[PDB]
Each structure stands twice: as C-alpha cells, then as structure tokens.
C-alpha cells in the first residue's frame, strides 16, 4: 500500500545520497588524473558521472530491471563522448552517425520487447489515467530519432559554461524522479542517481570550474533524458521539461540558416542563446542561474500536465 | 482521497508559480526606487519577497487559515529588519530586543489556541506515526526562544554573499512545502509561496547581486522557517534541514568567545564561516554552491527521519 511507495521513496533518495558519495569522492581522485592527461581546465569529466551512476545503479538491477535500457543508452552516448574526448587530447556528421547507431538499438528494444508502451502522453489532457496518448505507428521510428538527436544535441550545447548544464539536468532528473515514482513507473533509482551524480560533480563544476564534462558527460546525460521520457511515454514532456535543452539547438538552427540566407547576418548576438545573453552584459552565474530558475519553474508546469 | 491531496499540490505548485510571477516582475520596477535611498548595491530587497508572499498567501487564507499565524511572524520579523534598514540609510542589543517581542506573541499563539500540538517530533524514530514525541512543558517557552534566536540570526549570518541565503532558504521551504503536504499540515500555500517569491528575487540577486535583501528579508525568512517547523512539531529538524543556519551561528560563537578567552588568537579565518572558505581560495560561487548542495542532501537524510 503506502509501505510500498514509502520504501520506493526511500531506496530512491537512497539511490541520490550513494551516487553523491561517490560522485563527490572521486572528483579529487580522478582530476590530477584527467590534468595529467592535459598536460582551460581538464575536461573528459564525465567518466566520474558515469562511474557513479554505473555503481549505484548496479545495486537496483536485480529488482528495478526497467533500468538497463536506460543505462545502456547513457553508457552508450557516453562510449561516443569518450572516444570525442580522446581524439580531443591525441567531426558534427561524425558525431551525428554514432548518434544515429545507440538510438536504432533503443528503437529496437522498444518495438520488439514488451516492456513499455510506445504511445506518448499529452500533456495538458488528463494525466495518465484519464488524458490522451499520441500514437503514429509507421513515423514512431522517426519521430524517435528526431527528438533523441534533438534532445542529446541540445544538451551538448547547453554544457557551455560553469555549472549550466549540471544545474538544468539536476532539475530535469529531480522530475524525473517524482515523476517515476508516482506514477510507478521502474526508473526512478536510475533518475535519482543522475541527481545525486550531479550534485557531487556541481561541486567541483560550479564557477571557477576545477573540471569539464564532456561531451562524455553531456551526451550520456542527453540521453538519459531522452530515454527516460520515453520509458515513461513523456517524449512530449521533452519540450517544457528541456526548453532550455530545445532553445540551446534551436538558436543555433536559426543563427546558422539566418546567415547563410543573408549576407551573413546575424539574428542574436551569437549563439546558443547562452553566449547571446553574456554579450547582452550578463554575467556567466546569472545565466547559470536563470536558466535553472526556468527549469524549476517549467517543471512545475510539466507537473500541472499530469494532474 | 486522491483527489484532495492532488488538488493540495496543484493549489500548491500555482502558489509557486503566483509568488515567482509576482516577485520577479516586482524587482525591474522596484529596484530604481531603492537605488534612489541609498544615493554595493541597493539594499531593503526584502520587501519585494515579503509583498510577494503577502500577496499569494492572501488568496488562500480562507482555505488554508494556518498559514496566518506563519505570515504574521515572517511579517512581524519582516518590521525590525524594515526599521533595521531605514536607520541604515538615515544595534546587536536592539535586535536581540525586537526578535524577543514577536517571538513572546508567538508562543501566547501556540499555547493559548489548541490549533496545535506543542510536542517535538524525533528525527530517526518512526515518524508521525510511529516514532516518539518530546515534550518538556515548563521548558516550551525558553526551548522556542532559544530555537526561534538561533534560527533567525543563524538565517541573517548567512546573508553575506551574493545568492547565499536565497539558495538555501529555497531548499529548505521546498523541504517544508513536500512535508507540509504528505503529512497533511495546513501551511503548504505559504510554504511554497516562499519557495516562488525567493526565485524571482534570485534572478536579480544571484552574483553580481542587483539587489540586497534585507535584514528585511533575512529576518523575515528566520522567522518563516522557526513558525513554520513550529506549526509542523519539528523544530528538532532545523538542526539537520538548517545546519548551515546552524554553523554559521555557531562559528560567530565560537570565533568571538575563543578570541576573548586568547590573545585574540584565530579558530577559523574569519567568521561566519562563509568568509572562512572564501579566504580558502573559494569562489563567491563554490561557496553559494556548496551550501546549497549540503542543504540539498540534508533535506533528504531529514524525509529518512520520517519513515
Ligand atoms: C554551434 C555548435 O554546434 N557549437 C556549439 C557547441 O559545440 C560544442 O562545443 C563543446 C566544447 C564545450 O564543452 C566548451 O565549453 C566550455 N565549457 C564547458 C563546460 C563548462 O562547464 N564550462 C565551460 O566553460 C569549455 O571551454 C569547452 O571547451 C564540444 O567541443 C562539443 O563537441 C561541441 N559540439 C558540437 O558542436 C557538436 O557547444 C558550445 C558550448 O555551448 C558552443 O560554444 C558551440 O557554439
Ligand atoms: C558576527 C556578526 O554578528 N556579524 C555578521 C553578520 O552581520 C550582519 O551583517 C549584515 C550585512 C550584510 O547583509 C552584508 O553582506 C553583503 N551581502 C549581502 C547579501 C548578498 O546577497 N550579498 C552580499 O554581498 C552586503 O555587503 C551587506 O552589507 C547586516 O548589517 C546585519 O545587520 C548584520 N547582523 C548582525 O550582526 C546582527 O552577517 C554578515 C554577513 O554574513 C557577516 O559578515 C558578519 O560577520
Ligand atoms: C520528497 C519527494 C517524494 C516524491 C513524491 C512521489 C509521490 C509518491 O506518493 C504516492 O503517489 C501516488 C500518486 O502519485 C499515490 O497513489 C500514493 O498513495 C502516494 O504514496
Ligand atoms: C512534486 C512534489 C509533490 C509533493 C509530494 C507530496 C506527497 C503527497 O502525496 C500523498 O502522500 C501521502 C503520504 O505522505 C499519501 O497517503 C497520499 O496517498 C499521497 O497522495
Ligand atoms: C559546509 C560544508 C563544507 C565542507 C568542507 C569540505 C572541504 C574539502 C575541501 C577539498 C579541497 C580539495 C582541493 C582539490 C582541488
Ligand atoms: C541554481 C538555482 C536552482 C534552484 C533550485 C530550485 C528547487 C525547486 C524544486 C523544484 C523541482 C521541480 C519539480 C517539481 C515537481
Ligand atoms: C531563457 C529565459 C531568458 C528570459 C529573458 C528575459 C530578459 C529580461 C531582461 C531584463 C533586464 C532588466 C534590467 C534591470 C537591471
Ligand atoms: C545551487 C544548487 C542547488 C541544487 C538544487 C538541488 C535540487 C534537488 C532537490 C532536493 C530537494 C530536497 C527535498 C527532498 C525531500
């Protein structure tokens, strides 16, 4: 009854507190490592954030098993980031193509497996008991890979300043979470690890930042917050929950094209729109912070499409 | 049922959002005017977080009528530091003096009416529940006041750097706002009213700060926290949901008294402890980062402590 939800939410805030600890105590281990390998600040971070995830949600395999797919695609985006990374130290299209391959896996374990439903959820319908569910069948696998690419796309992009991505992403996952658990859906561990992953690397990322993502890290988390959504059947949710995600590419879309299309003109000052506001004599917190507040906000919005 | 707490988190999540609206649309308009009595930055920015709550919580006092006792506090808090400030532009005593008046009224409130109980909730014993309830009666009032003093002067020595005392006040009323609707008090509206009116300000006080709050704000806040745990039965949680509250008192004592009892020898760099990291080699940053993290994570081992 609520003993079942109880001990749910107290594995799950479990889950946050361990991947903390972990996240927290091998960023000092791990950065002279990851400078050695430099050797403006070192980046390929990420491993740290996969590392702890990878740990502690290893320990709810066993009895949340909605969890694998989720892992795999992160481990799977975060593959690609290493190997980024690594040519980095020792390119879009290229980059584009090992995009392309994780999520035709994921396309594959969603239609042949019976795990999960592949209709979307509408959001301000009805939530889940009552609402509308978004079905198109033959375009499931292009609308899949259009909002995956989008998603870890605009999520690289957003991880362009100290703290940006990391602070946006611990407010997406906490959705996430409350999310998983009330409408008892498998992922919650896993969600709640990126939280308490983050919050330990947000430590260490925040203003001036002692270590860099990714790339690693930034598309691994790009697709954990597509994968997730689409275990919950949110991939509509996408859009409010990651409109800073979807204006990070969508600023770049029109800036690109509006130049070409021109004389080379411009339509913001650069972009993603991050850079546009630090030009318009913003400091590089405040859009730390605005940008999360957003989120925050956002979320709660998301949320009020559920009831 | 089901419908009565998800109509609660919905009224709840628009109190969030009413409150943001209203002090994030407050702040371009009211900080010229307070730029123009004080020729950093423009201080008395608590009256915009205090006009905002006072607005949203308005709206649900019919409804919700525990809340009155919560905004008279926060309000009243609210008048010593607006008398504090005003004799800035045109102490230490004088405001120990004031905090004693409110929180005498207070405790009439609390032990006069039977609105609610006067037991104290133990963290890790079994919840509402379960658990166990400590009680000392003759020892009520000197408890409140040496609580309530702690916890307001704690909140004010937290105000120093820029986003500081808002990210943490954030997340200890989103804590409060989670509590105060699963166990079914009656201030979730005021609660979160906090949560959204402290967003907006963070916009504009987030570094470089565009505004200062208070001494208006910081008293109001203490006292927010203080009732708040006070109409829920866990004052016994502000040690652990406030222990950055907590520390910074506690480094002034301990600086001060050892000081005096030396040579006017050291413990720590500089009190409150904030200014200690910061001559660490801590960014203004890190410093609003770590705090926020640490209350983040506190907040949640405090929910362990309800089950
Ligand atoms: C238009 C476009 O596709 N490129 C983007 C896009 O390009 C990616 O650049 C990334 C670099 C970015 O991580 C830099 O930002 C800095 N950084 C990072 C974290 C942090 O916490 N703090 C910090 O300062 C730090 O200097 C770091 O080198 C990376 O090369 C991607 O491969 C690249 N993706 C693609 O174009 C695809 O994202 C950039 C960052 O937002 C934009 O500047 C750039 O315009
Ligand atoms: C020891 C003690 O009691 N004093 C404290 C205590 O004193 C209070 O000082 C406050 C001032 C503080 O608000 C300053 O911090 C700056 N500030 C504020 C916000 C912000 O967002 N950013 C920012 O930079 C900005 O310069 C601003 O003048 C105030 O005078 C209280 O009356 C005072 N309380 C008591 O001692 C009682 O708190 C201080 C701030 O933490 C400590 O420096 C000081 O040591
Ligand atoms: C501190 C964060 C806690 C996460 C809140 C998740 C809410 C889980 O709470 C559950 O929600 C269900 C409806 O959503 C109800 O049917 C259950 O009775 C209730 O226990
Ligand atoms: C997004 C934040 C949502 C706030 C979560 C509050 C949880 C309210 O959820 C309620 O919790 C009770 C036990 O706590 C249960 O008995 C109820 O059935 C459940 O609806
Ligand atoms: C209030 C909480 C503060 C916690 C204090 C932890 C201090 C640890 C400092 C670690 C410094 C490591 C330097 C690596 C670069
Ligand atoms: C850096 C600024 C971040 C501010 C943190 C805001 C925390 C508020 C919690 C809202 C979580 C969103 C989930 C709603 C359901
Ligand atoms: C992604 C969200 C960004 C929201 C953009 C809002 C821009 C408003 C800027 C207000 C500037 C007011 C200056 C007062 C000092
Ligand atoms: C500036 C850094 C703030 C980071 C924001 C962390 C948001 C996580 C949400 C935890 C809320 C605590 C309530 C637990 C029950």
């Known amino acids: 009854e609520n003993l079942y939800f109880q001990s749910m939410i107290h594995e799950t805030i479990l889950a946050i507190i361990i991947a903390f600890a972990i996240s927290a105590l091998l960023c000092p281990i791990i950065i002279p490592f990851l400078h050695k390998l430099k050797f403006g600040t070192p980046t390929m971070g990420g491993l740290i954030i996969l590392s702890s995830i990878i740990i502690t949600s290893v320990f709810y395999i066993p009895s949340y098993p909605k969890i694998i797919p989720v892992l795999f695609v992160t481990v799977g985006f975060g593959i690609i980031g290493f190997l980024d990374d690594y040519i980095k130290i020792v390119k879009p299209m290229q980059k584009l193509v090992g995009?392309?391959?994780?999520?035709?896996?994921?396309?594959?374990?969603?239609?042949?497996?019976?795990?999960?439903?592949?209709?979307m959820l509408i959001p301000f319908t009805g939530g889940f008991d009552g609402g509308?569910?978004?079905s198109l069948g033959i375009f499931f696998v292009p609308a899949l890979?259009?909002?995956?690419?989008?998603?870890?796309?605009?999520?690289?992009?957003?991880?362009?300043?100290?703290?940006?991505?990391?602070?946006?992403?611990?407010?997406?996952?906490?959705?996430?979470?409350?999310?998983?658990?009330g409408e008892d859906m498998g992922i919650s561990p896993i969600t709640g690890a990126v939280v308490?992953?983050?919050?330990?690397?947000?430590?260490?990322?925040?203003?001036?930042?002692?270590?860099?993502?990714?790339?690693?890290?930034?598309?691994?988390?790009?697709?954990?917050?597509?994968?997730?959504?689409?275990?919950?059947?949110?991939?509509?949710?996408?859009?409010?929950?990651?409109?800073?995600?979807?204006?990070?590419?969508?600023?770049?879309?029109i800036q690109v094209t509006?130049?070409?299309?021109?004389?080379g003109k411009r339509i913001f000052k650069m972009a993603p729109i991050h850079h546009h506001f630090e030009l318009c004599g913003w400091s590089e917190t405040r859009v730390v912070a605005v940008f999360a507040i957003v989120t925050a906000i956002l979320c709660m919005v998301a949320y009020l499409g559920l009831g």
């Open 99 to 119: 995009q392309f391959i994780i999520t035709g896996i994921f396309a594959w374990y969603l239609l042949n497996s019976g795990e999960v439903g592949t209709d």
């Open 132 to 134: 509308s569910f978004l």
């Open 145 to 181: 890979f259009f909002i995956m690419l989008g998603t870890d796309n605009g999520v690289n992009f957003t991880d362009g300043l100290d703290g940006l991505c990391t602070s946006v992403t611990i407010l997406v996952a906490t959705f996430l979470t409350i999310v998983a658990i």
């Open 196 to 253: 308490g992953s983050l919050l330990g690397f947000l430590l260490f990322n925040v203003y001036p930042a002692k270590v860099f993502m990714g790339d690693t890290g930034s598309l691994a988390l790009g697709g954990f917050v597509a994968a997730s959504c689409y275990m919950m059947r949110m991939p509509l949710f996408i859009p409010v929950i990651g409109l800073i995600y979807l204006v990070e590419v969508l600023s770049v879309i």
């Open 258 to 263: 509006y130049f070409k299309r021109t004389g």
